[PDB]
Write a protein that binds this DNA or RNA. Structure first.
Lengths: 97, 77, 64
RNA sequence: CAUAUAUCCUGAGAGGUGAUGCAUAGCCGAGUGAGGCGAAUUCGGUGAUCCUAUGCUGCCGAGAAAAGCCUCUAGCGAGGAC
RNA sequence: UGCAUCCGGUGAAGCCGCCGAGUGAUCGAGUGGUGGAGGGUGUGGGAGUGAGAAUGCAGGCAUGAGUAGCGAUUAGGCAAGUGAGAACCUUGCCCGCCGAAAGACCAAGGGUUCCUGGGCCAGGCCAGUCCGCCCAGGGUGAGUCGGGACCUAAGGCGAGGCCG
RNA sequence: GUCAACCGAGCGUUGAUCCGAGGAUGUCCGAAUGGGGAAACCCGGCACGAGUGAUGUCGUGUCACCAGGCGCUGAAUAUAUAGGCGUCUGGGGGGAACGCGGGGAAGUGAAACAUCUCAGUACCCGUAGGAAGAGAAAACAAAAUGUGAUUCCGUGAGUAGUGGCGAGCGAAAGCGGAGGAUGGCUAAACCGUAUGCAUGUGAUACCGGGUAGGGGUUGUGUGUGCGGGGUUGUGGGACCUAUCUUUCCGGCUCUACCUGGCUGGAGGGCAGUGAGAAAAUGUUGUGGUUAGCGGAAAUGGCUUGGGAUGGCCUGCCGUAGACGGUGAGAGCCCGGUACGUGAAAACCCGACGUCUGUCUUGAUGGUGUUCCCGAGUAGCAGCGGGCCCGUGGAAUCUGCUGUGAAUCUGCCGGGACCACCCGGUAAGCCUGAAUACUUCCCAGUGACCGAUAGCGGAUUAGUACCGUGAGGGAAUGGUGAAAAGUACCCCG
């Protein structure tokens, strides 16, 4: 059978100064699957964490293009999603900073 | 052409002539026409692309017969 | 740590229980891996395999 | 029945709010750059190739379509409309 | 290469040679240096079988030559700075240039060139601590913006269809 | 996994890594197929299910096009049809060559050139198959008492011949061979049938005579679909009609009775996945392929050398001295060979028993006459193709038009044509084996190359780079036995 799990969409966190400046004021950035969307991500998150999302965003990133003895390779695109948890305000513990 | 329908008398490709030759074809078409007919069985008028030869065939053989023979070939009549 | 004959004792709903559990584990592992709070990398492989086994058993039971 | 500045429509802009805010001249030490308080804020001229203007006037070369908006019924019609 | 025999890590070939030979193409089983694994001889067989020239092909290197140039008609300078190393890099005060553009914002197009940290054997028409150069990491957030989910013109594709 | 190391963290005798066969999953584009589209990215419908306080969202499926069959309706319009709706099965595109049918050039040669040749080649089209196509005499031949399906090879033959008788092209018969299946199935006359367009002797006829009820097995017509009978050349066949007449019965010949002729079952025989009808079945062969495995004999002695696999001297194995590697030429070190082994599963061969039919209700011959022996065809004329054959006296084979016949004293051919003799019986269909070919796969061989060679590509290779685009299209192999890859110091 096939079982829709929400935890197969959300792949991973983001770890960087921008992300931490966002966390200081309760905004969390995750890495998702490219064919996702905002309703799907909202549902995944306010299911997984039983916490009250109010607005979601996105972005795309065209991967870099490095060189080699062989030649011109290219990393992978992604989709970064950015969530602003509402006044509920239980931070995401499993993040681990 | 739309191609004959009762026999299959397709074209042919000639060539040269007299007075010294020159090599050069000129399709030898067949003589198809657009005669129509009437099927008393199913109460209908049918139009076909049939040579005069095939008309000869009809009038000494019938039309039912011919449409059955064409049904065999499964022409999209 | 499981095997197919061990799992084939389990009925469907038990398999789905373990399935959802293992996906939760894989998720928490990916966060740990990003954070750097992980060392035993290979658990990712092991979990991924176990999920495959479980779907495989389900499909066996659906084509039998 | 009608010629009224009637009535309606459309419509640049002036005015009030928007704005107890923002922000700004500057001052203070401060030195990477952090910062914090922060006055008056009226009056006239000039003048757009911009706005009313898809307007107006004139001419001949006589000047896209469809969706959208409004409307009349066909019909779905006992439930719902604001 | 067929066949028979000889030398060879106690140093073959190949290369640089010296001394010598043959009437000539050429030869040294004559010896030295380098070097590191296959070669010679006689008889026959078979040839991708001998290059100095094709405004011949491929690679490398010369003469010209340490010569011409170093990419506009705006014009650079002094002190201090870090640095191994400064005409050019950072800052200070001057100076000068464009100012319906050599200024600020979009579309096409390109694709990380953007920021930070480090770097300077390659590149920049000099050098370079510098750079759109090199490496790693980071970075692009839309109910209302430009498009799609709304519509159609030129034109295209074109069920069926007609012709061939 | 690897170029390709480094680091980290692990697994494994409870059998890992690895190899083989089958399955499962199988994002998006692509014939691409829900609609659309700038290929790999945008929007949806329907049924179900998950999910929210409801919407949004999510998951599983399915929805294109035509051809055919079946089913419902039958628009103008009356019959009724095209069409419309639903369901079921097919096809759709890719491929390296090889094939068959069709189309179809030119530079060249002719010392020019058009006819000719190059070539019916290249190329294009439509369709295939594991091979294809052709194929059972309307053939050859020459009076020999001959041959006997076809195809592919050798020769005949660079001949007879053809040809602006110029360049040049160019058979066949016959003979020797490979392979053998000197192969089978149909239509028509004639009956029995369902029918379907028509009619009405409305009766002395539908049948075996005859004894006969009916009063039509419709009475007579006519094509259709089914079943019998019939497959030939020295002609055969269907009617006719004697003779021997190689199983039992059930009912049928309209009908009870004598026969003739059907419709059933039964022992049986024959054959079978055959070209000659077609599906699956289960046994099944140490039969074959798809992983592999064992496998004989020297740490031998002296010397050289960094290392002995060398030289010299001693032994051995050998159904194994092929090859390669190992620190320098290794039968006795390693890998492996000669040789023998090995398959749970899948696949292929036959083998079987199922299963399926099929003849059995039968045949050999007699005998005198009517009927049938594949029709818009063969033939003739007009333009043309290709056959050695360029319109020539030009047969045979053929394409389009126009005209257009007979059924055995019939018809077609034996290089115009006519008479005689000879051979053969067209216009319906299938047919293996010999033959051609290699994208891929497996194992080997080489008086083939050995990094400017050999496939363009030993090195990231159809890559980089060039071009808008189709399309072009490169360069670069070697440390040494093993990285022991120069720790440490000095100048910078």
């Amino acid at each position: 059978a096939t079982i829709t799990d929400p935890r197969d969409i959300i792949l991973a966190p983001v770890i960087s100064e921008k992300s931490y400046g966002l966390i200081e004021d309760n905004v969390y950035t995750f890495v998702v699957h490219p064919d996702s969307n905002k309703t799907q991500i909202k549902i995944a998150i306010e299911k997984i964490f039983d916490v009250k999302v109010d607005s979601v965003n996105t972005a795309n990133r065209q991967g870099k293009r490095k060189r080699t003895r062989t030649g011109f390779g290219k990393r992978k695109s992604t989709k970064r999603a950015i969530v602003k948890l509402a006044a509920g305000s239980k931070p995401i513990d499993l993040f681990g900073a | 052409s739309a191609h004959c329908q009762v026999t299959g008398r397709g074209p042919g490709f000639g060539n040269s002539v007299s007075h010294s030759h020159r090599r050069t074809p000129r399709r030898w078409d067949p003589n198809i026409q657009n005669k129509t007919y009437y099927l008393p069985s199913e109460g209908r008028r049918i139009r076909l692309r049939v040579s005069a030869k095939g008309i000869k065939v009809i009038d000494r053989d019938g039309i039912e017969a011919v449409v059955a023979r064409m049904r065999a070939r499964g022409e999209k009549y | 740590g499981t095997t197919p004959g061990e799992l084939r004792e389990l009925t469907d709903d038990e398999l789905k229980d373990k399935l959802r559990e293992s996906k939760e584990e894989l998720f928490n592992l990916r966060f740990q891996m990003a954070t750097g709070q992980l060392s035993n990398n290979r658990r990712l492989r092991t979990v991924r395999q176990e999920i495959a086994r479980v779907y495989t058993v389900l499909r066996e039971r659906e084509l039998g």
